[PDB]
Amino acid sequence: SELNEKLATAWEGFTKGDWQNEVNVRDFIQKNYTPYEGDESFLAGATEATTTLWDKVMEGVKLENRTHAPVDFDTAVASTITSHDAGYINKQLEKIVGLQTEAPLKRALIPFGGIKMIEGSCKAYNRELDPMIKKIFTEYRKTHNQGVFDVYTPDILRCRKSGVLTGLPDAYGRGRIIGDYRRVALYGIDYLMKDKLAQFTSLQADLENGVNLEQTIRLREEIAEQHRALGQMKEMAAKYGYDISGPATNAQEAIQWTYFGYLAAVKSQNGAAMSFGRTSTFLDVYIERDLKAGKITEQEAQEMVDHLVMKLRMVRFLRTPEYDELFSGDPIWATESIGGMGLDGRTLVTKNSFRFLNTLYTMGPSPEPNMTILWSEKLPLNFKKFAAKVSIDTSSLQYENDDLMRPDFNNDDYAIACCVSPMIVGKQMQFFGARANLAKTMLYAINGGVDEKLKMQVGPKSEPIKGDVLNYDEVMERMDHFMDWLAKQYITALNIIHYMHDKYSYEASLMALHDRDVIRTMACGIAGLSVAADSLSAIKYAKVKPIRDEDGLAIDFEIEGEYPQFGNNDPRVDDLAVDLVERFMKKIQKLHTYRDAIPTQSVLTITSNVVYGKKTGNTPDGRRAGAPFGPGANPMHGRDQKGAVASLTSVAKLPFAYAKDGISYTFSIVPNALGKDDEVRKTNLAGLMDGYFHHEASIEGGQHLNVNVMNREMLLDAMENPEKYPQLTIRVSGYAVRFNSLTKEQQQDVITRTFTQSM
Amino acid sequence: SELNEKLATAWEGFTKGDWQNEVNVRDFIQKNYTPYEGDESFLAGATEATTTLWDKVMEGVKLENRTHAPVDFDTAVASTITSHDAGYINKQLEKIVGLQTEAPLKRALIPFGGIKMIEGSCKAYNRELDPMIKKIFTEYRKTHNQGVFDVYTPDILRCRKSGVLTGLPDAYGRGRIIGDYRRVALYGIDYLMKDKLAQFTSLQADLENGVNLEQTIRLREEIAEQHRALGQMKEMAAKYGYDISGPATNAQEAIQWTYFGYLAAVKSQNGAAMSFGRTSTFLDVYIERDLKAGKITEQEAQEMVDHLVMKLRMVRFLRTPEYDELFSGDPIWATESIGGMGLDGRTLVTKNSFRFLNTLYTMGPSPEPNMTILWSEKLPLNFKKFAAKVSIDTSSLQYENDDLMRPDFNNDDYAIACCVSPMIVGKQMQFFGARANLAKTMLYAINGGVDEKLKMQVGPKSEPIKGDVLNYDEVMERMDHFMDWLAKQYITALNIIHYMHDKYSYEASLMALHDRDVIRTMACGIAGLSVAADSLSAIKYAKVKPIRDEDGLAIDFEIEGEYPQFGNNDPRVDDLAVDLVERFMKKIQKLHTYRDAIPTQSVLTITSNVVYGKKTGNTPDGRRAGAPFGPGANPMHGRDQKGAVASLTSVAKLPFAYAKDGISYTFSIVPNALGKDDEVRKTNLAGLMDGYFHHEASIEGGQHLNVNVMNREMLLDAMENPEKYPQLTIRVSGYAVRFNSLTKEQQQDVITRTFTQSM
Numbered sequence A, B: 001s002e003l004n005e006k007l008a009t010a011w012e013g014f015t016k017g018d019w020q021n022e023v024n025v026r027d028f029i030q031k032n033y034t035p036y037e038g039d040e041s042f043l044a045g046a047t048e049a050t051t052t053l054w055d056k057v058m059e060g061v062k063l064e065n066r067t068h069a070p071v072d073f074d075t076a077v078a079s080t081i082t083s084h085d086a087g088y089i090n091k092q093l094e095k096i097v098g099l100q101t102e103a104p105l106k107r108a109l110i111p112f113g114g115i116k117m118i119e120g121s122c123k124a125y126n127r128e129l130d131p132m133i134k135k136i137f138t139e140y141r142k143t144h145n146q147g148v149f150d151v152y153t154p155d156i157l158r159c160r161k162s163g164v165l166t167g168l169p170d171a172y173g174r175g176r177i178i179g180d181y182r183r184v185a186l187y188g189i190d191y192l193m194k195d196k197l198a199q200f201t202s203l204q205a206d207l208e209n210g211v212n213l214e215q216t217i218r219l220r221e222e223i224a225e226q227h228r229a230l231g232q233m234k235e236m237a238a239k240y241g242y243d244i245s246g247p248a249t250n251a252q253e254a255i256q257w258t259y260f261g262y263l264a265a266v267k268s269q270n271g272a273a274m275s276f277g278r279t280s281t282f283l284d285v286y287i288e289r290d291l292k293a294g295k296i297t298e299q300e301a302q303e304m305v306d307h308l309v310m311k312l313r314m315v316r317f318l319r320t321p322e323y324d325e326l327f328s329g330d331p332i333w334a335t336e337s338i339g340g341m342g343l344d345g346r347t348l349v350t351k352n353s354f355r356f357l358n359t360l361y362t363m364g365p366s367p368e369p370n371m372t373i374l375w376s377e378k379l380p381l382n383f384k385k386f387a388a389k390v391s392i393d394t395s396s397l398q399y400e401n402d403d404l405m406r407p408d409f410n411n412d413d414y415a416i417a418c419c420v421s422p423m424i425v426g427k428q429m430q431f432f433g434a435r436a437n438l439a440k441t442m443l444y445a446i447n448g449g450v451d452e453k454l455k456m457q458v459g460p461k462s463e464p465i466k467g468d469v470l471n472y473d474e475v476m477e478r479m480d481h482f483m484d485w486l487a488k489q490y491i492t493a494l495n496i497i498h499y500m501h502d503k504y505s506y507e508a509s510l511m512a513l514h515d516r517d518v519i520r521t522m523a524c525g526i527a528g529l530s531v532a533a534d535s536l537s538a539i540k541y542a543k544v545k546p547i548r549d550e551d552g553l554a555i556d557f558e559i560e561g562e563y564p565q566f567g568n569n570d571p572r573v574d575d576l577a578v579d580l581v582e583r584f585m586k587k588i589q590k591l592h593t594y595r596d597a598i599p600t601q602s603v604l605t606i607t608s609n610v611v612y613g614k615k616t617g618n619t620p621d622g623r624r625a626g627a628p629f630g631p632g633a634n635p636m637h638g639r640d641q642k643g644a645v646a647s648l649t650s651v652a653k654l655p656f657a658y659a660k661d662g663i664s665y666t667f668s669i670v671p672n673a674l675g676k677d678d679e680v681r682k683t684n685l686a687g688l689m690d691g692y693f694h695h696e697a698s699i700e701g702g703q704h705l706n707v708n709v710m711n712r713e714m715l716l717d718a719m720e721n722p723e724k725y726p727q728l729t730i731r732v733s734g735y736a737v738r739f740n741s742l743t744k745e746q747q748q749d750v751i752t753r754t755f756t757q758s759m
């Protein structure tokens, strides 16, 4: 209660409010940002420095893509916020600085999560691990991975081996946490440390009085670790020549300070998704102030945004080949949520919303950061059209429904973590759960719990379904049974994982940038939704005959008659998909969870569509053994054949009400199907999204849309001549990848997906 | 359910029972031991090997005592069960092998408990800590000490600084855990590992069903760590050339296997007390079988016992000078519980009970192991007299009331941890709490919570007592108030400490030798009982006038009139002491504890009588500022002036019912007061103990008695000429020390205590 000079100088001219007396970034934004309803005509192009820097870094990116391996990585240093010396691309040119290690794209060792994974990476990429690192993290500091495997059950291990529940966060950082990095810029580290000491002290009475004793002790230790991490952030920044004890005083510092908060996160944790947040409009407050004061020019502002975004394009983590199969394309999910509307009806689009999108022109297409447009039917048309143009030109953006999510939270300061999972910034996080194989679960119902590939009893022993023709009611009754079992094994695995991750790899630097009490959801994903829905549809509307082996195991199916497939706006099958989503949500909702994290569901797969597909045999819908499932909530490859409106309609029917962790849809449309020329294409794409996301009391609308605007012929050319397309980026599951970063098998999945040929 | 050949061979001839089908050491003992009612005439003397070995080790002991520092210690190795190579005194001579490090008396670094303490020891003893050890245990593996200090409150820190609650286990291993080391001998490691996997598996249903989720996950991880520690025990033993996968097959192996279980404990944990258990009668089963088979001679049996006991005399831990003030004399508390009676009325005294006592003759007096006689009025007179003779000759034994403790537990297989704290072996442990300063708490009541030395507000702000004469009712009402506050701060500190010790230094190798579910008590000790009781007595029966400074602070007292002092069998003051014990027990009983550990109390101080005394000003009883309190439950120095029966009577009145963690009494009697000659002295000492420990429905009896039989003139000679008394041992607080191991200040405390001059 008395702002020192540091705060005074930094906050000069800002509209006053609660944000000056307590940590409240949303209040600061609301009182200070400038809504922008204009067009992209004010945008500046790249400076020579930006191009020199990015062109150099791209040589490392090309090396990564051609070798499908890291440019370099540590073999003898355990990474922490302060372990590495300052690293640069070219110190004379960078306006925003900071790298994870001492060299661009060199990956770190983050051992707290597990030592076996590091050993696996060293073997895979032909480097020798320092014996000391192995010793420390085997005998002295236990890891998250070992804690989990020490407590797992034989049943969970069988599910992992068989492909019914695989790829969970037992061997990589859980992620799904977004510290509010904007807090570093707004308040400075010292203010945040004082606030954390107050939070710590506020728990003393409960501790002394024996109120929720263990929970209170745990939280006090976590806050002490958060406070320690904040101090370490100052030391890290000082290595780069910056004193971040006080608040940022100008645009360059606001961008730099925010990035430093994020840099501490990616130097200390290797979460699968390390998302950036909802920062562009916040940063516009500082940029606008400097532009009006004549302190910086628009080109200088674009340059600072470019250098920040360039650093987000350089975040890297050492991963194993196994991880690469589950999360393809060397992803980071440095997700940035752009635009949206405020609860007061004003748009949250700012000139900076345009500057962030402009990085796809100043430095070309790029998969990271994962730029996510928070769409509203009320967004300024100028912005709707520019975003559509950027999608048409680069296929690098995704869109999510602000008209659905803002009212659901009654909050206009939520951000997207990873692909499609919303959280109020600094107040909420998710316990990541990857996803379960719903399609294989259906086969288990038909086969009495016996795996169709391993011929091992994995699910509970049950009587396999008999007869030469499958009956929908019977199959669905057994499937419901196995969904109960799946939910229990899944939540049990996640309870173990998150208990161990809190114990052995607590994300102190990210949690330090959250309120004292954070809302946690237990995010359960489902893979193979359209395979399961179409399988049920074939059984219900056609005649499906099981082909059994000498043991009675259904290893194939013959289908007589046509049946409705998901993605063609046919309620007969779409209703089955909606039902499966509701059904699984209701089952996980009944189970006890670690830290009482609220169960939620997402229809999302990342590359588990390929991994689970490889481990799943022939299914009733006609899909062949080993074939990929569709990505996320997508109709199976090529089955949506009635056009864009029809497939968008089928997907929009899936209920966000029962899948609050998100519903991913990857939409690819050929240029000429989208429109006759550029202007018409922009108008039509904005129109398609307005219809898909349309929300009213009786219509939920879709929640997410990846948009690719390309001809399949071009991707085939890139498969044959990768050198011609070094920056070619494509949306694939709720994030983007450089097409050349994928393995051939992953490219085959992508090229056989639906390329929509009509409205 | 099918004993392999390993078990068959090892158990040949033993009486069958439950012990062969489940881990049940008590059942094995009950069905196989041979009660011995004879005398000491069968005992053999030392072999040349034993004398050669012990004489060599004693040179290291003399070096420790003269330098008051370790002979040597590690500066670059973090100790674990397998870290050190095999070490020997003289491999050609040892019948029982195993040392903590690679050299006799060389102390280890056990960093999991804290790195600052290690830094403190290195500085104090002039050795340089390896930078790598400091780095690992500051940045990679957090320690118990740092976890505690990260969560402590400013109030607890003020209590620690002021001397009202100091010396708690926030900077050293908590100890008070006795794994059942006999299990290694009886079953072998493989059988115990299979049993632990079954215990782990038995928790799967609760885990899956969400029953006490966090508790279940925690216990499963603990059992996995226990299983891992058992495997490490096999590797440790193999370094010494032994395969302990199967059960011990003869006496030498039973002793060796039991010792290996203990060796793993003292290589991995540095608990203040690392007690041995109740092993002598168990080991007699194997010795008796070999003697009857003619496999070994009695002298060979004594030699194996001697070599085992010699190793217990060599256990060492690196401690700081601060620790040395609180726990003087380089103590280990390798406590062994001898004799006692079974629930069936048979004595549990065996020939081995005599062999253990005989080590005080074969290798001379020694403070460790801490041999504790479980006394019963029904013990064979031959044993009562031999134990009395050993006390008369060596002052190295203590006695505890089996007639009180066995019926309290309805169990005849409990052992004493540290000094006086009983636990059923393998089924119970204590969360150690050190002790609180009850005397200073009384001054706080008189001074409104302000510390009499620091002039700082430590206790809650309260109105200091006014007037020129203190009133008992008023003082007691305020004291009760401050006892409530003390209890809450104490239990809060212990809740933090034990949560952190379970997290950062879980005693896996010891817990591996316990049942799945262990009963835990939260052991709270009180120091200064007789100072507080006598202060209340002076106030109540005499006229006590406070001497106040310019601030109204009572810094001294003048007493007009005589008043009854504790230890003279005067109910007027003894009732006050009994009341204080009951009062504090009732207050801690109301508080919530970590892991729902049952609060218990002990009247025990170790050297906190000196440390708290130094930090406590003048008290109402007349004790001067800085003077030591009495040890444990002892009357203040020299105040028990009516003889042995009178002081034993006062102490026996203290209620074990309200101090289940134990009540320590150190009794020293001059030889001629005890009896005219040797035979009379033995008879009289046994008679005094029979009376003190006498128990019936209406008489509890005393719980513990340290017995010193010496002339003060002899101790004065030892203070002046230590070289003349290298093995001189004396009981001091519930354990023994070599007199030469004490600092001069600690010796001054000891020499000014009461030397009883009459019955």
Ligand SMILES: CC(C)(COP(=O)(O)OP(=O)(O)OC[C@H]1O[C@@H](n2cnc3c(N)ncnc32)[C@H](O)[C@@H]1OP(=O)(O)O)[C@@H](O)C(=O)NCCC(=O)NCCS
Residues within 6 Å of the ligand: A116, A145, A146, A149, A150, A151, A152, A153, A154, A157, A158, A161, A171, B196, B197, B200, B223, B224, B227
């Ligand atoms: C080693 C262990 C995992 C079982 O090993 P297993 O019989 O080979 O198990 P699986 O066949 O299911 O294989 C384990 C899989 O997890 C992988 N893995 C990842 N981290 C691992 C870790 N820390 N330890 C072991 N395996 C690990 C293995 O590489 C393997 O992957 P794969 O199927 O692609 O080859 C054992 O720790 C275990 O059974 N744990 C369960 C809990 C338990 O028993 N605790 C001890 C109780 S006393």
Ligand SMILES: CC(C)(COP(=O)(O)OP(=O)(O)OC[C@H]1O[C@@H](n2cnc3c(N)ncnc32)[C@H](O)[C@@H]1OP(=O)(O)O)[C@@H](O)C(=O)NCCC(=O)NCCS
Residues within 6 Å of the ligand: A196, A197, A200, A223, A224, A227, B116, B145, B146, B149, B150, B151, B152, B153, B154, B157, B158, B161, B171
């Ligand atoms: C460093 C800290 C202990 C306070 O230090 P301080 O102001 O010097 O405290 P005190 O004066 O009471 O001294 C601490 C005593 O504990 C000792 N100590 C033992 N282990 C220690 C450890 N890990 N850290 C600090 N002191 C330690 C110190 O040496 C000192 O002993 P002394 O009184 O004989 O000199 C600080 O960690 C603290 O206040 N912790 C309480 C919890 C807290 O604030 N957590 C962070 C919340 S965001």
Ligand SMILES: OC[C@H](O)[C@@H](O)CO
Residues within 6 Å of the ligand: A137, A138, A139, A140, A141, A142, A143, B225, B228
């Ligand atoms: O070696 C036993 C250790 O506790 C290990 O499990 C973690 O470091």
Ligand SMILES: OC[C@H](O)[C@@H](O)CO
Residues within 6 Å of the ligand: A064, A065, A068, A069, A070, A319, A321, A324, A328, A329, A330, A741, A742
């Ligand atoms: O280590 C890099 C990964 O192997 C690659 O798949 C990323 O495209």
Ligand SMILES: OC[C@H](O)[C@@H](O)CO
Residues within 6 Å of the ligand: A225, A228, B137, B138, B139, B140, B141, B142, B143
């Ligand atoms: O190793 C424990 C430390 O507190 C670490 O978590 C931060 O440096």
Ligand SMILES: OC[C@H](O)[C@@H](O)CO
Residues within 6 Å of the ligand: B064, B065, B068, B069, B070, B319, B321, B324, B328, B329, B330, B741, B742
């Ligand atoms: O390190 C040994 C201790 O300093 C000594 O007090 C033991 O007698």
Ligand SMILES: [Mg+2]
Residues within 6 Å of the ligand: none
């Ligand atoms: Mg395996």
Ligand SMILES: [Mg+2]
Residues within 6 Å of the ligand: none
């Ligand atoms: Mg201090």
Ligand code: NA
Residues within 6 Å of the ligand: A055, A058, A059, A726
């Ligand atoms: Na290039």
Ligand code: NA
Residues within 6 Å of the ligand: A079, A080, A081, A082, A267, A268, A269
């Ligand atoms: Na770190």
Ligand code: NA
Residues within 6 Å of the ligand: A080, A112, A268
């Ligand atoms: Na860390």
Ligand code: NA
Residues within 6 Å of the ligand: A214, A215, A216, A217, A218, A219
């Ligand atoms: Na907790």
Ligand code: NA
Residues within 6 Å of the ligand: A588, A589, A590, A591, A598, A599
């Ligand atoms: Na729920």
Ligand code: NA
Residues within 6 Å of the ligand: A651, A652, A653, A654, A655, A656, A700, A701, A702, A703
């Ligand atoms: Na919907």
Ligand code: NA
Residues within 6 Å of the ligand: A684, A687, A688, A691
């Ligand atoms: Na349209």
Ligand code: NA
Residues within 6 Å of the ligand: B055, B058, B059, B726
């Ligand atoms: Na000697």
